[PDB]
PDB file of C-alpha atoms and ligand atoms in Angstrom:
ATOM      1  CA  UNK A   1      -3.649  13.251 -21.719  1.00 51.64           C
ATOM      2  CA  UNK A   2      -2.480  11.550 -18.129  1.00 53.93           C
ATOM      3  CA  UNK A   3       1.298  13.362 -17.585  1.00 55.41           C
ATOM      4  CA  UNK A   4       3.193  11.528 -15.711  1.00 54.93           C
ATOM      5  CA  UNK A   5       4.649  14.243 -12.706  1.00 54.15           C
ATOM      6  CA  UNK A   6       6.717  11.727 -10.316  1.00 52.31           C
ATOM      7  CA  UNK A   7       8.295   8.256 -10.809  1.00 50.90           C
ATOM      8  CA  UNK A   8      10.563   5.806  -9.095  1.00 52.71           C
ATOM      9  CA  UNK A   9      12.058   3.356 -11.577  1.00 53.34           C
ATOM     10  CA  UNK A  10      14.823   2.556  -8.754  1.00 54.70           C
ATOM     11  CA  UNK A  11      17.193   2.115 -11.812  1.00 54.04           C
ATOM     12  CA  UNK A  12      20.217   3.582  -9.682  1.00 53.39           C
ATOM     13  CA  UNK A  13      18.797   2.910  -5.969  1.00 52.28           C
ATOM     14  CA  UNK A  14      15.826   3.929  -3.788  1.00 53.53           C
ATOM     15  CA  UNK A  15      14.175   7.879  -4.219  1.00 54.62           C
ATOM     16  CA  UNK A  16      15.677   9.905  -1.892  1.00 54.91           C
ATOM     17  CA  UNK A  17      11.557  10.918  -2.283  1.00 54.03           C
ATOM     18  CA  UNK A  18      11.028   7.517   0.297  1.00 54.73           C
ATOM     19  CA  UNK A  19      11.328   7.830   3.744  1.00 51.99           C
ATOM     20  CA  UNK A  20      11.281   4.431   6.093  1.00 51.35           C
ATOM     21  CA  UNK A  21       9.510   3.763   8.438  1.00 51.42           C
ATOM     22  CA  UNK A  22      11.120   1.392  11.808  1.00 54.68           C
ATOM     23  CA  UNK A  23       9.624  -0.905  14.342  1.00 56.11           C
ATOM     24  CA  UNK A  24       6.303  -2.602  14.969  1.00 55.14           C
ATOM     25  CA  UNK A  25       4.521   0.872  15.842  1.00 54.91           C
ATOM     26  CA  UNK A  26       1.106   0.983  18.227  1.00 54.21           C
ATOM     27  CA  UNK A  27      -0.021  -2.303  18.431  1.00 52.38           C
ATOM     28  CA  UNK A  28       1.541  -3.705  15.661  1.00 50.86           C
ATOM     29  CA  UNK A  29       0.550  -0.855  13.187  1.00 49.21           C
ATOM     30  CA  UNK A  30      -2.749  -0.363  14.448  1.00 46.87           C
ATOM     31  CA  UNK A  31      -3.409  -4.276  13.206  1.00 45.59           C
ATOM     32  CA  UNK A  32      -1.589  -6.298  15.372  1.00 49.49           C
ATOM     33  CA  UNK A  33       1.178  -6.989  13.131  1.00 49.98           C
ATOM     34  CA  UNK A  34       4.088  -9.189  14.416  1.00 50.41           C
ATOM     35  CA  UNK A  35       6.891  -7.447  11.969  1.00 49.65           C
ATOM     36  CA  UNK A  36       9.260  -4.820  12.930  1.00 48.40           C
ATOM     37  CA  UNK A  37       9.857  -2.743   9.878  1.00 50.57           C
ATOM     38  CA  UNK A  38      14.297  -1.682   9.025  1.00 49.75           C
ATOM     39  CA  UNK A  39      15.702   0.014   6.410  1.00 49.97           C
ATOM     40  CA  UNK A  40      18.017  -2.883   5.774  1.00 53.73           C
ATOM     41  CA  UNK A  41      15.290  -5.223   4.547  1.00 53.04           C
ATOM     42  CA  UNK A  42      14.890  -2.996   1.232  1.00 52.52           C
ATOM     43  CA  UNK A  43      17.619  -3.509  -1.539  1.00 56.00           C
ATOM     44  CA  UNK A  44      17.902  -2.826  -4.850  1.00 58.63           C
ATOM     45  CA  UNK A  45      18.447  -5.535  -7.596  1.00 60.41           C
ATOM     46  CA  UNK A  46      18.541  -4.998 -11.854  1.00 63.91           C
ATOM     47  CA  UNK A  47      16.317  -1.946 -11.549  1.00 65.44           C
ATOM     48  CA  UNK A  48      13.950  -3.099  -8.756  1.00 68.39           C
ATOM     49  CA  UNK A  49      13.070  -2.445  -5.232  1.00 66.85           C
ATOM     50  CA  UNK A  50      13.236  -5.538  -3.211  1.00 66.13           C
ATOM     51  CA  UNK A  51      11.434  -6.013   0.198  1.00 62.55           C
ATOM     52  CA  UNK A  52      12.490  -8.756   1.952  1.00 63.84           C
ATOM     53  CA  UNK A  53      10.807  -9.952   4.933  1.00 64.73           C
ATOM     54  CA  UNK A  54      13.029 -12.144   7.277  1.00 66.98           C
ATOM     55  CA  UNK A  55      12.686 -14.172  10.073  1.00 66.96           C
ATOM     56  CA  UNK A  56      14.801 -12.414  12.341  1.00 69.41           C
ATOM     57  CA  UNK A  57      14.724 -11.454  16.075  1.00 68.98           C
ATOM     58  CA  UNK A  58      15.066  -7.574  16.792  1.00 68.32           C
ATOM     59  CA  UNK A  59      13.318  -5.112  19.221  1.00 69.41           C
ATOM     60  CA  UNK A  60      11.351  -8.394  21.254  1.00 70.30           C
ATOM     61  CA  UNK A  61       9.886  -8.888  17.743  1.00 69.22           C
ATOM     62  CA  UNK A  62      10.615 -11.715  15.353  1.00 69.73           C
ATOM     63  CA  UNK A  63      10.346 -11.082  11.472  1.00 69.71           C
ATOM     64  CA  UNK A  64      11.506  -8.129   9.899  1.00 69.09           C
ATOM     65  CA  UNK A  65      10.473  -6.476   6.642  1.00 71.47           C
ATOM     66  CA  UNK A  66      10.096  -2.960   4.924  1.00 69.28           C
ATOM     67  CA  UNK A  67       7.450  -0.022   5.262  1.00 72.16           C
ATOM     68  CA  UNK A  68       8.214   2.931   3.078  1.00 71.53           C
ATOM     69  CA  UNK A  69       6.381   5.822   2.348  1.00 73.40           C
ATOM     70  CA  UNK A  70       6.528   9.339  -0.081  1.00 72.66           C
ATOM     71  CA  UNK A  71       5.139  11.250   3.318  1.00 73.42           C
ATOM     72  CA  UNK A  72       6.566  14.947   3.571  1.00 73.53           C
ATOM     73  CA  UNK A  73       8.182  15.041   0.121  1.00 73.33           C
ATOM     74  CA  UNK A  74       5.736  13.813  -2.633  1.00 73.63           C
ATOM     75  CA  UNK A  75       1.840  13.776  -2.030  1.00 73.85           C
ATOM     76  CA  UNK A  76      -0.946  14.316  -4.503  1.00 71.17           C
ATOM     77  CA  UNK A  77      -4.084  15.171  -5.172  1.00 68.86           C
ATOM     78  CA  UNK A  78      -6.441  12.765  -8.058  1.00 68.60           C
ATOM     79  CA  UNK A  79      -4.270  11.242 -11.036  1.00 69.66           C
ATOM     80  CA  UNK A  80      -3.505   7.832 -12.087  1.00 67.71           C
ATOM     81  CA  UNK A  81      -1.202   5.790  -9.490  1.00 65.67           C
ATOM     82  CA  UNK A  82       0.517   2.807 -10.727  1.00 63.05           C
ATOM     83  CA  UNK A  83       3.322  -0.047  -9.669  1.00 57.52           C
ATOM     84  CA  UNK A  84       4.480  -3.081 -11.191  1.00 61.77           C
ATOM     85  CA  UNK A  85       4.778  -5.633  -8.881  1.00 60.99           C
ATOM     86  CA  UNK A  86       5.775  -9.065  -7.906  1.00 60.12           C
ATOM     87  CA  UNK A  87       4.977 -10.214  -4.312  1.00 62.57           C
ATOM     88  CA  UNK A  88       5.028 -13.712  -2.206  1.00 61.30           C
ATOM     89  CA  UNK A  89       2.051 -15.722  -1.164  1.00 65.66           C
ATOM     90  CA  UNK A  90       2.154 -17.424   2.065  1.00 66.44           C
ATOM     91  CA  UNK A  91       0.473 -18.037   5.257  1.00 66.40           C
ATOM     92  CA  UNK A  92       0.663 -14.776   7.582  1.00 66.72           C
ATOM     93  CA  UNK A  93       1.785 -12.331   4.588  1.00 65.49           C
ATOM     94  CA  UNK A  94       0.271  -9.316   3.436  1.00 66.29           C
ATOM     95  CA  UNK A  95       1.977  -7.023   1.493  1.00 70.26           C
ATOM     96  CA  UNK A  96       0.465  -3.831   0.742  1.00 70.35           C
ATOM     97  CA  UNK A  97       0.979  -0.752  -2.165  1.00 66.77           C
ATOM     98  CA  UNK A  98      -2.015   2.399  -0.622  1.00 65.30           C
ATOM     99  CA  UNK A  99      -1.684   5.873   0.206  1.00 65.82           C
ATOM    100  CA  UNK A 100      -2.864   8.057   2.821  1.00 60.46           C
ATOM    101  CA  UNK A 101      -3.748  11.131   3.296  1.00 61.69           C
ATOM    102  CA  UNK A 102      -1.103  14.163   4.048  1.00 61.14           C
ATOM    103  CA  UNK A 103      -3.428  15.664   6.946  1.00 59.07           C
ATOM    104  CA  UNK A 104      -2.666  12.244   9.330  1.00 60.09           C
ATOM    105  CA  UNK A 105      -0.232  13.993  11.358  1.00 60.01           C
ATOM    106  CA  UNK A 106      -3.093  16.914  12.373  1.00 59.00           C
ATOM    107  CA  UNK A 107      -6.222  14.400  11.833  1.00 57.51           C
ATOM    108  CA  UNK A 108      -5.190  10.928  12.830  1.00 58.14           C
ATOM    109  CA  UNK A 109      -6.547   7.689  11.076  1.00 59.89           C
ATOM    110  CA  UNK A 110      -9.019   6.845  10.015  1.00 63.31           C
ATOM    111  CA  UNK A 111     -10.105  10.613   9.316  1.00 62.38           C
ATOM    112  CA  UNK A 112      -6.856  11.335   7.254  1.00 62.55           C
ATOM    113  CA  UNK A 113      -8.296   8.796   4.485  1.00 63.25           C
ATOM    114  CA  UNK A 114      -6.882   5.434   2.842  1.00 64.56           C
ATOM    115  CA  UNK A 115      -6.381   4.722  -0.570  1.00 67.93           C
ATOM    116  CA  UNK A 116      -5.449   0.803  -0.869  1.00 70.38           C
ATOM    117  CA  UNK A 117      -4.316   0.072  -4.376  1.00 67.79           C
ATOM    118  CA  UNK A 118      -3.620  -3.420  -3.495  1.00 69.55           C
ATOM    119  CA  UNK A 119      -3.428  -5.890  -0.967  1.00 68.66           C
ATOM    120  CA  UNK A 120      -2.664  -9.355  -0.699  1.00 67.57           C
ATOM    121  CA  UNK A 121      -2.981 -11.785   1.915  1.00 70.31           C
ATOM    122  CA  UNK A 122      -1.476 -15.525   2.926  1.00 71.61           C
ATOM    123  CA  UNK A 123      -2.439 -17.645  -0.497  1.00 70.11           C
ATOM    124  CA  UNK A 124      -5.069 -15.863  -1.763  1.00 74.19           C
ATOM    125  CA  UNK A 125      -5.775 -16.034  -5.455  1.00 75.06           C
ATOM    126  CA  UNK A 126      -7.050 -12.979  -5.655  1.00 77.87           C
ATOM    127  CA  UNK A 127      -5.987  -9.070  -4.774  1.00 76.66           C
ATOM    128  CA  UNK A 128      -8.197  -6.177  -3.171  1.00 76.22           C
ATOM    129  CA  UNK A 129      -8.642  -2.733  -3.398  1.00 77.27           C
ATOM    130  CA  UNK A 130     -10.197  -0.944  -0.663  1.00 77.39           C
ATOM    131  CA  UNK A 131     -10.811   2.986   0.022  1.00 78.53           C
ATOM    132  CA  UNK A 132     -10.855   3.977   4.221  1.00 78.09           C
ATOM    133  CA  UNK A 133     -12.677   6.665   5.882  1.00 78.54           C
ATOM    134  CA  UNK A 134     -14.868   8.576   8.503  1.00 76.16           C
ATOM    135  CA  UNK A 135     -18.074   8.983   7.055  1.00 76.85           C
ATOM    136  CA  UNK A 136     -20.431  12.091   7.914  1.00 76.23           C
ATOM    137  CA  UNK A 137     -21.869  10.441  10.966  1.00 75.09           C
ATOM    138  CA  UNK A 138     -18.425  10.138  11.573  1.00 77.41           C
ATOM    139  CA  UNK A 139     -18.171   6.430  11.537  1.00 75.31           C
ATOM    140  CA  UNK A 140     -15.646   4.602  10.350  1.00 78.29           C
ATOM    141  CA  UNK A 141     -16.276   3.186   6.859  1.00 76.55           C
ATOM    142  CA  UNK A 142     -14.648   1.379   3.922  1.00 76.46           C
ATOM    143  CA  UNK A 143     -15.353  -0.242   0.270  1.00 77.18           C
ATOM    144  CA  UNK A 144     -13.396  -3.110  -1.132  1.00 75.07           C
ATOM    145  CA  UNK A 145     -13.707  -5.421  -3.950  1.00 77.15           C
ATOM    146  CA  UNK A 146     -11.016  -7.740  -5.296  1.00 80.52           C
ATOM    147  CA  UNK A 147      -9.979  -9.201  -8.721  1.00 81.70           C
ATOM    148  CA  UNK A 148      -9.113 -13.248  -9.747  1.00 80.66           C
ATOM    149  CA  UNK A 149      -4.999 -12.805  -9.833  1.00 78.03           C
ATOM    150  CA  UNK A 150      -3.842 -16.658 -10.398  1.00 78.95           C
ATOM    151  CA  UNK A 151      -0.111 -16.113  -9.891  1.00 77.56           C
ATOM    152  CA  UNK A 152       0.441 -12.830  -7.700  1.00 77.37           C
ATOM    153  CA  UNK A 153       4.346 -13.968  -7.419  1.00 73.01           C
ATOM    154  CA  UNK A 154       4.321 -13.116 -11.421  1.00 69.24           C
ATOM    155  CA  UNK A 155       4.680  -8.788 -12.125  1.00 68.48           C
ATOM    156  CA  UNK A 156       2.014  -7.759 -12.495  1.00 67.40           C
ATOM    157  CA  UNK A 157       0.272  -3.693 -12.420  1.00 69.95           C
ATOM    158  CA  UNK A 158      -1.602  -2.510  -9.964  1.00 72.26           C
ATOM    159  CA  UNK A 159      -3.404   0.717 -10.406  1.00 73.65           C
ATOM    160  CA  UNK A 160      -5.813   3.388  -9.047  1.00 72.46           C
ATOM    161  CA  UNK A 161      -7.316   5.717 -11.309  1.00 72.15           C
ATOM    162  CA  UNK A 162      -8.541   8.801  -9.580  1.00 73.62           C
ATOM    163  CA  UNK A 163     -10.476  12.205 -10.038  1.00 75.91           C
ATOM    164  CA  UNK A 164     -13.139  14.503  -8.213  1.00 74.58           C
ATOM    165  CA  UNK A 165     -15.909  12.247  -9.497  1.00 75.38           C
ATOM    166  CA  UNK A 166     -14.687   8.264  -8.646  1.00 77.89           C
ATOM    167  CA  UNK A 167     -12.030   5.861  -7.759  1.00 74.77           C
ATOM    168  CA  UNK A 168     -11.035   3.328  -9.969  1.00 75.75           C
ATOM    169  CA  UNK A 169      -9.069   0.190  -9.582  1.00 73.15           C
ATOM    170  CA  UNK A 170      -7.415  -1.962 -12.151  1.00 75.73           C
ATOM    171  CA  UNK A 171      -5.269  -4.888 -12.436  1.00 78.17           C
ATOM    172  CA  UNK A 172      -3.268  -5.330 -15.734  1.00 81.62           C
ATOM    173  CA  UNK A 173      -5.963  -2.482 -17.411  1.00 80.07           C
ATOM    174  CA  UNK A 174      -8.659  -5.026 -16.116  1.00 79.68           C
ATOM    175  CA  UNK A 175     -11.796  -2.513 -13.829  1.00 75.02           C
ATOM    176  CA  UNK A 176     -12.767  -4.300 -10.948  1.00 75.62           C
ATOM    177  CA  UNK A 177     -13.574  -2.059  -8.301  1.00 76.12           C
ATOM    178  CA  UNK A 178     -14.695   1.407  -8.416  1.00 74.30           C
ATOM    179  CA  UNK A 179     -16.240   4.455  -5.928  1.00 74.74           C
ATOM    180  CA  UNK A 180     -17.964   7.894  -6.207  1.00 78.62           C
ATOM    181  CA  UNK A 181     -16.425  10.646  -4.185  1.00 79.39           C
ATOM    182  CA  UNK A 182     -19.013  12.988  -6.090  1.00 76.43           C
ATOM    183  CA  UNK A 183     -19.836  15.194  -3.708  1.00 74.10           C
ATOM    184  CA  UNK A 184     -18.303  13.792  -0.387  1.00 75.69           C
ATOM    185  CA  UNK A 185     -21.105  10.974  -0.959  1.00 75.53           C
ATOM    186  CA  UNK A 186     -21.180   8.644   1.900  1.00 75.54           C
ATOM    187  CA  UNK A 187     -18.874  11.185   3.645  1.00 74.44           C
ATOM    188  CA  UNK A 188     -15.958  10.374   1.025  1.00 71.35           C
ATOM    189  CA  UNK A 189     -14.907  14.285   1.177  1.00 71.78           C
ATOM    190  CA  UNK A 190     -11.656  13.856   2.936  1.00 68.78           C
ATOM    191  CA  UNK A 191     -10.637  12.127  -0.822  1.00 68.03           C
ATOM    192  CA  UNK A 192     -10.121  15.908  -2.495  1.00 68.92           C
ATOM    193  CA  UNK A 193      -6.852  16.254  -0.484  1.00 66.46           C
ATOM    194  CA  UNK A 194      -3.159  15.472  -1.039  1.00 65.11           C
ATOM    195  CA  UNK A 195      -2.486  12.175  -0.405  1.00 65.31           C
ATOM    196  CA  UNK A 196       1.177  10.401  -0.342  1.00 64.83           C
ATOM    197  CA  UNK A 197       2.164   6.656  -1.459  1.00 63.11           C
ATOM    198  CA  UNK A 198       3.555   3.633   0.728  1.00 62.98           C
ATOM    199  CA  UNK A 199       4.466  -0.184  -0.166  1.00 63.52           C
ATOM    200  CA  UNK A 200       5.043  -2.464   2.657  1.00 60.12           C
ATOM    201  CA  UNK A 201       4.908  -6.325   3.906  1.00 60.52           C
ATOM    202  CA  UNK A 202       3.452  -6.512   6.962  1.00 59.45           C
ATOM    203  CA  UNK A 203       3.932 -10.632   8.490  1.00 59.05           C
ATOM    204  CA  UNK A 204       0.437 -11.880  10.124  1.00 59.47           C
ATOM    205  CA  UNK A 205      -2.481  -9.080  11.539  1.00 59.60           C
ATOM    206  CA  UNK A 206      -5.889  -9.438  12.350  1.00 58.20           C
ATOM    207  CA  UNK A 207      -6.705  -9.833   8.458  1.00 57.92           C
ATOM    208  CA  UNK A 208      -4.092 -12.321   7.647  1.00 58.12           C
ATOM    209  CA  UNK A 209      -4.273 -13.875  10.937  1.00 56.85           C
ATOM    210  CA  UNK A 210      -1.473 -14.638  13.480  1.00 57.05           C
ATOM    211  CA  UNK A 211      -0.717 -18.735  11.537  1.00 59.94           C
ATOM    212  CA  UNK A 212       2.431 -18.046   9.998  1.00 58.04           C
ATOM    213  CA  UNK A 213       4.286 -20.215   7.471  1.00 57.84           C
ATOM    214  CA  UNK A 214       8.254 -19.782   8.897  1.00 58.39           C
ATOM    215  CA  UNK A 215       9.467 -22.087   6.277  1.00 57.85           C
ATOM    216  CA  UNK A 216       8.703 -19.169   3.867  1.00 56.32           C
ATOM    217  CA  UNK A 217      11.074 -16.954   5.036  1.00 59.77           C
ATOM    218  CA  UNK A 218      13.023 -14.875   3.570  1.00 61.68           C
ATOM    219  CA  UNK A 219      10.391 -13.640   1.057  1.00 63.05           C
ATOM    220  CA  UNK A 220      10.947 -10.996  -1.336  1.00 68.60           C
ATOM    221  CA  UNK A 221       8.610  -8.693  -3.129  1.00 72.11           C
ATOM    222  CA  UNK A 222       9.294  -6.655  -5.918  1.00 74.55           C
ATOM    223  CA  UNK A 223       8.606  -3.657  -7.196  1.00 74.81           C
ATOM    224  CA  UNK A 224       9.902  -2.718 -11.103  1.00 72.41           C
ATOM    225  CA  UNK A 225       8.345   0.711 -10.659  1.00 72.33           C
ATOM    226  CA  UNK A 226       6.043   3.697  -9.147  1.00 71.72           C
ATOM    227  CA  UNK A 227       4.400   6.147 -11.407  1.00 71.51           C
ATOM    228  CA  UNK A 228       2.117   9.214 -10.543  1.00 73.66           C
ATOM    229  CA  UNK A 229      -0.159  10.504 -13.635  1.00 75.60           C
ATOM    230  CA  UNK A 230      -2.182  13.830 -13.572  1.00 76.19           C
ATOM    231  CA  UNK A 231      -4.620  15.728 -15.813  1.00 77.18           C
TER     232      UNK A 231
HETATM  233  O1  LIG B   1      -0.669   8.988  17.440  1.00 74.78           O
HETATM  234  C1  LIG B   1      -1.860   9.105  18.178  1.00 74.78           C
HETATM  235  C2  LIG B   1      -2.457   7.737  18.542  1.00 74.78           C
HETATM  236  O2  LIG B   1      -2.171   6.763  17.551  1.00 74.78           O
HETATM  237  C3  LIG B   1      -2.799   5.495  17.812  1.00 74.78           C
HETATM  238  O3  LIG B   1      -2.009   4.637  17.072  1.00 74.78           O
HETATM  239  C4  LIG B   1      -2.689   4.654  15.849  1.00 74.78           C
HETATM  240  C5  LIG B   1      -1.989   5.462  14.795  1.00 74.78           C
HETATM  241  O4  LIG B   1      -2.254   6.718  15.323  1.00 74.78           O
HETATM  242  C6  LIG B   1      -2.625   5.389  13.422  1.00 74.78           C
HETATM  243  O5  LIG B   1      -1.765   5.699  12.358  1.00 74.78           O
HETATM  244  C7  LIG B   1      -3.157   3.981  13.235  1.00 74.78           C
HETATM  245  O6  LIG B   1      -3.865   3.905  12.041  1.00 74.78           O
HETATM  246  C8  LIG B   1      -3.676   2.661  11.427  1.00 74.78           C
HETATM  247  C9  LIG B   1      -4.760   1.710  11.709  1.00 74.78           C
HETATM  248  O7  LIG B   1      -4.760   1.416  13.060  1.00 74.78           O
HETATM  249  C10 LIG B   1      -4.588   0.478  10.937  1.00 74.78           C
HETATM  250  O8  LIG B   1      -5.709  -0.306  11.061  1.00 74.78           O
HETATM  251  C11 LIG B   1      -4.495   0.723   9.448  1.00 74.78           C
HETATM  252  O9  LIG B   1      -4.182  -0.452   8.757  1.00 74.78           O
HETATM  253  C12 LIG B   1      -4.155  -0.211   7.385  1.00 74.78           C
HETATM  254  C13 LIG B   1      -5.438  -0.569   6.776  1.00 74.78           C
HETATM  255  O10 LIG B   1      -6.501   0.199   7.230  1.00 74.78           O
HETATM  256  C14 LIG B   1      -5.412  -0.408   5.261  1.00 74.78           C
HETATM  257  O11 LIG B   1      -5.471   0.968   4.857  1.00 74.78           O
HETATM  258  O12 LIG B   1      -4.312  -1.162   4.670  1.00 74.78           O
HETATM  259  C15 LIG B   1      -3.060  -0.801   5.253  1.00 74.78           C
HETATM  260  C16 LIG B   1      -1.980  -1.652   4.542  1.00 74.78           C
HETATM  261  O13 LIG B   1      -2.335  -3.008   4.500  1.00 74.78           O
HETATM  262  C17 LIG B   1      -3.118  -1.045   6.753  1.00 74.78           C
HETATM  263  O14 LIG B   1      -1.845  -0.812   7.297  1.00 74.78           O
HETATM  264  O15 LIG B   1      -3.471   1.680   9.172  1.00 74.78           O
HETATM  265  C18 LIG B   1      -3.629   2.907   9.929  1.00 74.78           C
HETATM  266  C19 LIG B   1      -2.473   3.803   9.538  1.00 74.78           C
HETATM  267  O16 LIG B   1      -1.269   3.095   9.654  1.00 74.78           O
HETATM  268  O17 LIG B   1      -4.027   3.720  14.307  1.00 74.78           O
HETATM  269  C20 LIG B   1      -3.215   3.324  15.336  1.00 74.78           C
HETATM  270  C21 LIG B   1      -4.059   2.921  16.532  1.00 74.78           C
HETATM  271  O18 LIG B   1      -4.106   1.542  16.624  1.00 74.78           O
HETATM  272  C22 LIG B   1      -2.776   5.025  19.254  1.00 74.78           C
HETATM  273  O19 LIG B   1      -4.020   4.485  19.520  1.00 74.78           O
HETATM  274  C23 LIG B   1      -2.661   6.079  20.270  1.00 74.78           C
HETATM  275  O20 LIG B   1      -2.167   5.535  21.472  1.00 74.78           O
HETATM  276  C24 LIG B   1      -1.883   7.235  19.857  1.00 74.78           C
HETATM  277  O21 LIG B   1      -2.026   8.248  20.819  1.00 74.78           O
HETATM  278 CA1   CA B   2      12.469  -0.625 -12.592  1.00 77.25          CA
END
């Protein structure tokens, strides 16, 4: 059987197991990003985590949202990885549920590994899943494939499955994308370590693009849960 070994329902408030992240960090993120990322802009409403991204002028940046990540308290190692979620669509978003890998601090990115369980960007009727890495020629490399999601503003769950053999990614139970770490084929080796869990909405980037839709603002996404599964 999967057991589940960490959750977040945010029934009370937030997981003391969350740690936030602030500011629009190098270079927007690494990606250009225009937000700059508070503590303030992640609330708590009838059992769910709410991100709201604002426009709002801080720093010599001018929208605001939440990054939040399990770094330095939870991480883990395969197992089923799960939220329910509800998130905007609009030109310049792109909210984001991934994980990365614990070694990031020593190893840097893209080494350190990313797990994306979903992304979104602007209107898209769809969602992706994507894993990142440095291959053995020590390139950088990543795998994505995406899933028909008509109305991403609806909950729905968003989930990895993962072991020693393959990544899997679902949406509502539904396979869509999937990878072999057998191995460390194609240099996927740095995928048998701890990794920990973020959610954030980033506003505009070099995937969304930098065309923003300000009459969108605020926009919330939420999040009924997190749930970590092992064998
Ligand atoms: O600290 C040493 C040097 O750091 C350099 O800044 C780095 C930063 O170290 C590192 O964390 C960052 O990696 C990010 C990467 O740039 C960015 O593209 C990536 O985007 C994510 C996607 O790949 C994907 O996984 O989906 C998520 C969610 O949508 C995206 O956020 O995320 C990486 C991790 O955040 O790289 C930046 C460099 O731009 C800096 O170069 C140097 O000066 C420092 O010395
Ligand atoms: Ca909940």
């Amino acid at each position: 059987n999967w057991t589940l070994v960490w959750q977040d329902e945010f029934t009370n408030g937030i997981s003391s197991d969350w740690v936030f992240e602030t500011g629009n960090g190098n270079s927007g993120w690494g990606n250009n990003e225009l937000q700059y990322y508070r503590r303030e802009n992640a609330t708590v409403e009838n059992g769910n985590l709410v991100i709201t991204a604002k426009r709002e002028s801080i720093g010599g940046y001018n929208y605001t949202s939440t990054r939040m990540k399990t770094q330095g308290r939870k991480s883990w190692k395969y197992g089923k990885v799960e939220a329910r979620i509800a998130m905007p669509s609009f030109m310049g978003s792109w909210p984001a549920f991934w994980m990365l890998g614990d070694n990031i601090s020593s190893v840097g990115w893209p080494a350190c590994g990313a797990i994306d369980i979903m992304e979104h960007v602007n209107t898209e009727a769809q969602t992706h899943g994507t894993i990142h890495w440095q291959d053995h020629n020590n390139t950088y490399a990543n795998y994505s494939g995406s899933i028909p999601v008509s109305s991403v503003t609806s909950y729905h769950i968003y989930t990895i499955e993962w072991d020693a053999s393959v990544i899997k990614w679902f949406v509502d139970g539904n396979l869509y994308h999937e990878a072999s770490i057998a191995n460390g084929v194609n240099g996927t080796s740095e995928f048998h370590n701890n990794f920990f869990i973020l959610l954030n909405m980033a506003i505009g980037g070099n995937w969304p693009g930098f065309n923003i839709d300000n009459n969108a603002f605020p926009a919330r996404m939420l999040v009924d849960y997190v749930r970590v599964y092992q064998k």
